[PDB]
Amino acid sequence: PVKGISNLNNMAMFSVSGPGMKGMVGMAARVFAAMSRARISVVLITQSSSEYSISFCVPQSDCVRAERAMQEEFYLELKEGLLEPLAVTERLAIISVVGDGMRTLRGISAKFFAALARANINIVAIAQGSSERSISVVVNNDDATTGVRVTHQMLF
């Protein structure tokens, strides 16, 4: 019941964290207001708990403008250490599997990750929302096509 496998290459991932971040109001709202003003395409956003970093992906072509905008928006917090230094990881890619609806993603998730793990492809981040039946994984850009191939063999 798989729809398709998609890949977006040449992405960069930002990760914002800090000891204060659990205690600060509207941190995601500020991050994404800053990206919106800078006209930056935020393709993936993930935060696994209030204590862990907010991570988000942008196309590599937007990476320098996004970093400058993040440094501007969080200047005070960074200088004071409420936020740890911004983490920027370049040369990434996003592989996604699209279901045909929600129900059958159970076997699909297990199979998707099993294929990547068999290929020894490191997963840098994961995002699956509750509305679309689709799972996105962030990998190193050099692994993108191999990741599509092994996922395709497993699922089709």
Add this chain to the structure above:
Amino acid sequence: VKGISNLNNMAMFSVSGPGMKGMVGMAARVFAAMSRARISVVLITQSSSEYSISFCVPQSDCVRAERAMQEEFYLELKEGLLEPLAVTERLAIISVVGDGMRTLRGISAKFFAALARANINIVAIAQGSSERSISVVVNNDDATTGVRVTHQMLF
């Protein structure tokens, strides 16, 4: 835009530990164990450099999913390669679905702005790249307000 939706009575599991960065296949093991248990995983997020994984299940599946995790990771938990499983109950997932353009630019900003204005704490976020939709995990107590205020902003 296309809609604002709500799932109540969710539980969120978080799997964390030194072994998450450097052991092969940890997400594969988590989701094989959920699959063997016939437990639908409605949300997944992994965001930190320490590679902790969080995922949500319906509250009715919480006891069986906890047992499946304890069985799959029995040896890593005993060795301390994984820290004790974290389990948060009484959660809701609010999702916004947009149209076909990269509209989440204005959408994701305003959605998070509406929740912050309402003083609604965010428990987890997941937005994949293939859908124009964004899901946010909140306390179940805040779900009805969170939806009302995100309707007000984005409509």
